[PDB]
Amino acid sequence: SYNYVVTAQKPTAVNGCVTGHFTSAEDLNLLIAKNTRLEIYVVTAEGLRPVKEVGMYGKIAVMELFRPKGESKDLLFILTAKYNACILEYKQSGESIDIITRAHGNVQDRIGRPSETGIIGIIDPECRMIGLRLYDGLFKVIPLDRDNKELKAFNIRLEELHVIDVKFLYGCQAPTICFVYQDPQGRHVKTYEVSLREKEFNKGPWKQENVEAEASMVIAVPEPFGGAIIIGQESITYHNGDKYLAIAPPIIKQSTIVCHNRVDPNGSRYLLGDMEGRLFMLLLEKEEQMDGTVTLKDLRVELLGETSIAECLTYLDNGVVFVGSRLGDSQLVKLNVDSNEQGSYVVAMETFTNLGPIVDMCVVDLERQGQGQLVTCSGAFKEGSLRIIRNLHIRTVPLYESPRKICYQEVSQCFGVLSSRIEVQDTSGGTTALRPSASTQALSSSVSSSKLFSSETSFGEEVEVHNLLIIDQHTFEVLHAHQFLQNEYALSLVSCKLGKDPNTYFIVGTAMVYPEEAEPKQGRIVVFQYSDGKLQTVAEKEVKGAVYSMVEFNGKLLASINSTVRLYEWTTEKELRTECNHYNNIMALYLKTKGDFILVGDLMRSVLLLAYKPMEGNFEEIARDFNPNWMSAVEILDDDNFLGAENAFNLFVCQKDSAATTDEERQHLQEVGLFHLGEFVNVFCHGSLVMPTQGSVLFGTVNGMIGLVTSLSESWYNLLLDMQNRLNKVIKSVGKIEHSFWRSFHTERKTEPATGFIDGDLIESFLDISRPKMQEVVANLQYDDGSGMKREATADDLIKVVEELTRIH
Amino acid sequence: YKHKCKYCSKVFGTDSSLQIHLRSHTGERPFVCSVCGHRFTTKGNLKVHFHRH
C-alpha cells in the first residue's frame, strides 16, 4: 500500500529562542525555533510584530546569531539533527522577503559516538570559528572564512570524553573553550586554547581541580569581567584565573536550574529558569575601583516569580522576557521594579498556544454536526491541559496536573480522563499536595476501597497519585475524581458496553508498582459506571501483571497483561470471566483491533498479528515481523496494512504478503513503506476534522504537531511521486537541504530512502508557486485519467487534484 | 585412525605398541566409554551405550 502524510497543525512547542539584529542592523529581532519551523519577530513597544515564518528540511538543533567583521547585520547559523549545517541571511527586496543561504554543508562523521549531553554548538566571540560538540572525544571546528561556503571543518582529539557543557570564553588572547567534564575523580572545569593554525589544542588559561558534583551549566561572562559562571544543584560559582566566588543560595535547592539568558551586554544580570517554572535573577555585584578596573565582589540570587516550565528564556526589552515552553504555553512576561502584594515581580502579558506534548487524543462529534473535534491530553505537571481542536479553533481547559489517557462516553455526555498529580510525603502518615489541581478540586470525589492487595518507607521524595476524572463535555468542569489505590498506577482506559448489558461503563486497567519489584506481578481491571452524577464501582478483577492495554472486542474486553493477551467475557452476574489466553514471548504493549484481527506490539517494534477464531474460541497467530528498534505507537490501516511510529521520528507501514505461496511467506509481514516524519508520534487515532483517498488517521506528537495519514491508489501514488521529484527541482530549500535526504528513514546507524509515502506538505505547496514554475513542473507528465491512454497533464488539471487533497484536513 | 584399542579406544601408532598396552585392560569389566568413563563387560554393551550419547 501507498500512503499520503500531511500536517494538519504545525509543531507548537518552542525549542529555541535567540535575539539579535537579523533583519535590520537597527531592528531588534526575536528568533524562535519550533522543531522544523523558524519564526522571526521584531520587538516593538506593544509586543511582537511577525516578520517571516519558514520551514526547514530538518530538525533545528543549534540556532545562534553572529556578525563577522565587515557584515551589515547578523548572520544565522543553524545545524539540524541530521547534521545539516548552514549560514543564512535575511534579504528583503521591497516586499520580497527571502532567507538566503550564504554557506552550507553536512558535518556528519561516519565514525563517532553521539554524545550523552547532546549536540552542542558554540561560536567564539570574535566570530572566527564555529565550535561543534557532536561526538565523544572530538571537537569539530568550522573555520569562518568568507571563502568557506561549503563549511569544511576538522576535528580535535579530546581527552575527557564525557563533556557536560562548553562555551567560548570572552576577553581571551586566543579562541578559548571552557567546559565541564566528568572523569573517575569527580567533576571538573578546564580550558583549551584553539589553534586554527596548528589545528589542535594548546594549553588553557586555567583548570579548576574539582567543582560541584552536579555542575551542569557553563555561562561565559562577557568582556567587562571575563571568565565563566558554573551552576549546579546547590551552588553557583564564578571562575577566572585565580579569582573565585561561590554561593549556595537555599532558594535554588528545591529544583534544578536548566536554562539561562544574559540580560545586558556587560553580563551583570542573568535570568535563570528551573524545571518547576521558577524564574530567578542572577546578579553579579561589580565593584568600581579607583584605577580603571572593575572587580566582581559577590553573587546574589533573587526569586522573581513563576512562569511556564521554560525550555528557553530570552530577555527582549523594557522588562519583557520571552518564555519558550515545551511542556506548556509560551509566554511574554513583564518584570516590574516593585514586587506585587504576593511577592512576585512577574506579570503575564501574552500566552501562546502549545499543544505539546500530546500524550493521548480522541475524535468526538460534540457539535453532532458530523464535523468532528480533536480532544487531547497535553502538557505535563502544572502545564497539563485538555485542548479541544476544531476546524483551526483551539479551546483550552487547564488541569494543573498530568493527563495521561482520555476517552468519550456519549451516553453520559462527558469525558473520562486518567490523570497524575505529584504529591510529597508528609511528616504524618500520608502525602500532601504540591498545589491545587483538577484531582483535588472536583464537585464530588472517591478513593478506591479495594483492599484486594494486603501485604517501602517513603522519606520526602515524590510520589505519583493517579485519578480517573469525569469531565463534563460542555463546561469541562471536573464532575468527579476517583483516586486509585496507593502505589497503583493507572495505565489503560476505555468506555464501552459489554456482553448483553445495556450500560456503558468506564473500564480502567492498572499495575501495582512497587520500587523494589522490577516487573509488575499484580494489576487490576476495574469496571466503573457513573450514572446519577456519582461514580460507582461495578466489580474489579485482580490480575497477575500490568494491564498495559485494553480494547473493546465485539462485546467482550480484550486486555494485555505483561506478555499475555486475554479475552474477557461479561457475565450476567456483572463480572469478568476469562474466555481464552494467547501467551506471547513479547510484552504486549500495543493492542489494536479491526474485525477479528488483533495487532500486538512491543517497545522494540516486534509486530504480531493475531486473529480471533470464533469457531474455536481461541487466538491464532497469522503473521509476524520483528525488527529491533524503538516503537512509540501503532495502528491498523486496514485488514492488510499496519502503520507504526519508530525511531528516529520515522513512520513505517508493514503489510500482509499477497505473494504468499509457502506458509513461511504468509507468516512474515513485509515492510512496504518508510518515511522520516520528523516528529515523535504518541498516538494514532482514526477520525477526521472535515465533512479520492481512502481512510483518515490523525496522530499527535510530542512537539504538539498534528498530522494526517491517508492511503492512495497506485495510479495517484505514482503520479504524486513524479511530482515530488519535479517540485523539488523548483522549490528553494532553506539550508539548501535535499528533500530526499530529509525524508530518508534514519537511525543513528542506518539511512534508507523513503518509500511508499508521499509528503503531503510538499504536494500542497504546488499551489503556492507561480505558473512559470507551475507550468515547468507539469512539462511532459503523463496521467492516468479515466481514459485508458495517459495524456499530458495540464497544470490547471493539477490544481484540481491538489485542491482535492487539501480537502482532507 | 589406525590401531585402536578395543576397550578404551586409545589409538596407537603400530600394532606392536597396541598389544604392549592391551595387556593393561585386564579386569572384570574392561571396555570403557570414551565419553563417560562408564565401564562394560562386552564390546557390544559398550557399542549400544556409546551410540546413545
Binding site: 553521539p114 564525557h162 557536560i164 557543557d165 512509540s632 525511531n647 521520528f649 | 585412525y1 570414551s34 565419553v35
Partner: protein, 346 residues
C-alpha cells in the same frame, strides 16, 4: 574481524558438535592428520574457522566464526595429538556448505551485524536536560535516583519510567549480575564485561541451557533483547530436568555454585577429547551411580569422580565427585553435563 553483512568462505572442522557463542572458548583435541594440517594452515592466514550450530543430523542454519589463540603439540605413544583452544567471534547465517575432498566442509556464510540501539530516551530528551544526562555513578536508593533522572522524559510519552527501565541495558545487567553473584562467590563486579554486547554473550555461555535456547539467543541480534531473554530464563527455568525423559527433575537453580575460579559451568575435556560443559551443583536427585570413585583425569584436583545416570531412562547426566582428602569442602558435589539437562518452568 570480517566485514559486516559480508560473505566469506570459512573452513569447518567436522568433529566439532558445539553451538559456539561469540566470546566463548572452544577447546579441541585432534588426532586426524587432515584436521591437524587444517589447524596448522589456519594459524597463519586468519586463524578463523566456522562452527555450525546444529538444529541435529547435519542441519545447520547459523553458526559462529572461531579464532585459534592457543596451540600445543604432544607427540606421545607414536601419535601426534594436537590440543587447540579457539574463541568464538562473529555470528553468521549459512548460505551453502560445500564438502571438500579431504573432508573439511567449506561454508559460504553471511556475517551477521550486531544491532546497537540508542537509549530509549534519546528521541524525546529535552535539550535543556541534555546537560543532566551524565550521572555521578555508584545501594538501591541509588537505582531509584537513576530511574527518576535517566527516564524523566517519559512524561512526554504514553509510558511510565518503570516500563522504560525494563528495556534499559544498564538496569538489565545489574539485575542479571545480581543472580550470577548467587552462583559465584568469587565474582567481583569487575570480573564482568561493561559493554552490553559482550556482557550478554558471556551470560549466554554461562547459563545451563539446552541447544534450543542456546540457538534462540544466537538468533537474537539486539543486546537488549538478549539480556531480557536471558534474565527471563534465569527467573522462570528454576528447575533442571533430564533432557531425554524430559519429566525427571535432576537439580534446581538453588543448588548451583562455583567450585573453581572459572565460574559455575566451565568447559572441561575428558581424556579422549570430548568436551563437557560441567555445571557444579550441591544436591541432585533421581541419579544412579555407576562404579567406584576414580581419580583418573579428575577435573577438580582433590576429588574422585563417579559416573551418574538418570534413574528413569538411564541416560548420562554427569558425575558425582567426592573429597579424597578430608579437610576439603564441599566434601561432595555433582558435576552435571549441560548436553544432558533441560531447564524447565514448574
Amino acid at each position: 574481524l570480517h566485514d559486516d553483512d559480508s560473505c566469506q568462505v570459512i573452513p569447518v572442522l567436522p568433529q566439532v558438535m558445539m553451538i559456539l557463542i561469540p566470546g566463548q572458548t572452544l577447546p579441541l583435541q585432534l588426532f586426524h592428520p587432515q584436521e591437524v594440517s587444517m589447524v596448522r594452515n589456519l594459524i597463519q592466514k586468519d586463524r578463523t574457522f566456522a562452527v555450525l550450530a546444529y538444529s541435529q543430523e547435519r542441519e545447520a542454519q547459523f553458526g559462529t566464526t572461531a579464532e585459534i589463540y592457543a596451540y600445543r603439540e604432544e607427540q606421545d605413544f607414536g601419535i601426534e595429538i594436537v590440543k587447540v583452544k579457539a574463541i568464538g567471534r562473529q555470528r553468521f547465517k549459512v548460505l551453502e556448505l560445500r564438502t571438500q575432498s579431504d573432508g573439511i566442509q567449506q561454508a559460504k556464510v553471511q556475517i551477521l551485524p550486531e544491532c546497537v540501539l540508542p537509549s530509549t530516551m534519546s528521541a524525546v530528551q529535552l535539550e535543556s536536560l541534555n546537560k543532566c544526562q551524565i550521572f555521578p555513578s555508584k545501594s538501591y536508593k541509588w537505582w531509584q535516583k537513576y530511574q527518576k533522572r535517566k527516564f524523566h522524559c517519559a512524561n512526554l510519552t504514553s509510558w511510565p519510567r518503570w516500563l522504560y527501565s525494563l528495556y534499559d541495558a544498564e538496569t538489565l545487567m545489574d539485575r542479571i549480575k545480581k543472580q550470577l553473584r548467587e552462583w559465584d562467590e568469587n565474582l567481583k563486579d569487575d570480573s564482568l564485561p561493561s559493554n552490553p554486547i559482550d556482557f550478554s554473550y558471556r551470560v549466554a555461555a554461562c547459563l545451563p541451557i539446552d541447544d534450543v535456547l542456546r540457538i534462540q539467543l544466537l538468533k537474537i541480534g539486539s543486546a537488549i533483547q538478549r539480556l531480557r531473554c536471558e534474565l527471563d530464563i534465569m527467573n522462570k527455568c528454576t528447575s533442571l530436568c533430564c533432557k531425554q525423559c524430559q519429566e525427571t527433575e535432576i537439580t534446581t537453580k538453588n543448588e548451583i555454585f562455583s567450585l573453581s575460579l572459572c565460574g559455575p559451568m566451565a568447559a572441561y575435556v575428558n581424556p579422549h577429547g570430548y568436551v563437557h560443559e560441567t555445571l557444579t551443583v550441591y544436591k541432585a536427585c533421581n541419579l544412579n551411580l555407576i562404579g567406584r570413585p576414580s581419580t583418573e583425569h579428575s577435573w577438580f584436583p582433590g576429588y574422585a569422580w563417579t559416573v551418574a545416570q538418570c534413574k528413569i531412562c538411564a541416560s548420562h547426566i554427569g558425575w558425582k565427585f567426592t573429597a579424597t582428602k578430608k579437610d576439603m569442602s564441599p566434601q561432595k558435589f555433582w558435576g552435571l553435563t549441560r548436553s544432558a539437562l533441560l531447564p524447565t518452568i514448574p
